[PDB]
Amino acid sequence: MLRLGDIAPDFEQDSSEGRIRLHEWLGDSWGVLFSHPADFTPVCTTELGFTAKLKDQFAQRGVKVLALSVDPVDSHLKWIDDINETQDTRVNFPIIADADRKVSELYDLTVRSLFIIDPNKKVRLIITYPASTGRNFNEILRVIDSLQLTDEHKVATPANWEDGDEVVIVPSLKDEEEIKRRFPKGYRAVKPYLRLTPQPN
C-alpha cells in the first residue's frame, strides 16, 4: 500500500539505544530502515553484522541506519552479543522493538523489507528480499549515492553507474540556456533523448 514518493510514517518506539522518534531522530540526514521478521535468525545476523561494519560508509554519506524487529529490547541486546561475537563487529545503530506492532502496521510489513528515506522523510526505495537470500550492501550504498546526486542535479544514473561515473541529463529538462547554465562541462547528444554529461559534482 506504502509506496515510493509517500512520506515514511513517523513513530516513537523503544530501541537498543533508547526511544526513537523517527523524523526527529533522522533530522537532516538520509535514513535506511532495515526490517527483520525475528531476532536470532541467521541471514539477519550476518546482515546486521555487515551494517555495523559499514557505519563509516553511511556516516560519510550523512545516512543514519535503524533495524526493526517485533522482539523486545532486552532480546535485541542478547542478539547484539551474538552478532558482535560471531560477526567480529560492534553493533553501533538502533534496533527498534515493535512488541505492539505499531511500526509494522505503518510500514505495511518469509520476506524482509528495506526503506531508504530522504531528508524530506519521503520513501525513495523499497527492497523486499526472501528469507533464502542475504542482501548485497555495496548495492544500497550505490543506490544512496545515485539518490543524493539526482536530488541535487537534474541527472539520472545509467546502468552500472558508480559514484563518479558519467550520467544522463534528465529527459524533462529541455531548456537549452538552463542546460548550458547547469552543465558547464557540456554533454554529448549521442541521441537527442540520450544526453551524456560528466557527473556535475
Catalytic residues: 44
Q: Would you count residue 69 as binding a copy of itself (CB under 8 A)?
A: no
Q: Would you count residue 139 as binding Cl ion (CB under 5 A)?
A: no
Q: Would you count residue 127 as binding a copy of itself (CB under 8 A)?
A: yes
List residues bridging with 34 in a β-sheet: 67, 114
Stretch binding Cl ion (CB under 5 A), from 88-96, 98-106, 108-116, 153-161: 153-161
Q: How far apart are CA 195 and CA 201, in angstroms?
A: 17
Among the listed residues 16, 69, 75, 146, the single contact to a copy of itself using CB under 8 A? 146
Residue with cell 529541455: 174
Distances in whole angstroms, Cα of residue 107 to Cα of each of 8, 10, 33, 44, 199: 8, 10, 10, 19, 34
* Partner from Cl ion, a copy of itself, none binding residue 43, C-beta < 5-8 Å depending on class: a copy of itself
Q: Would you count residue 81 as binding Cl ion (CB under 5 A)?
A: no
Distances in whole angstroms, Cα of residue 143 to Cα of each of 135, 139, 149, 155, 156: 13, 6, 10, 14, 12
Q: Would you count residue 162 as binding Cl ion (CB under 5 A)?
A: yes
Q: Would you count residue 71 as binding a copy of itself (CB under 8 A)?
A: no
* Partner from Cl ion, a copy of itself, none binding residue 143, C-beta < 5-8 Å depending on class: a copy of itself
Mark residues 40-59: x for contact with a copy of itself by CB under 8 A, - for none: xxxx-xxx-xx---------
Site for a copy of itself in 100-119 (CB under 8 A): 111
With b meaning 16 or more CB within 10 Å and e meaning fewer, what string describes 157-178? beeebeeeeebbbeeeeeeeee
Site for a copy of itself in 2-21 (CB under 8 A): 4
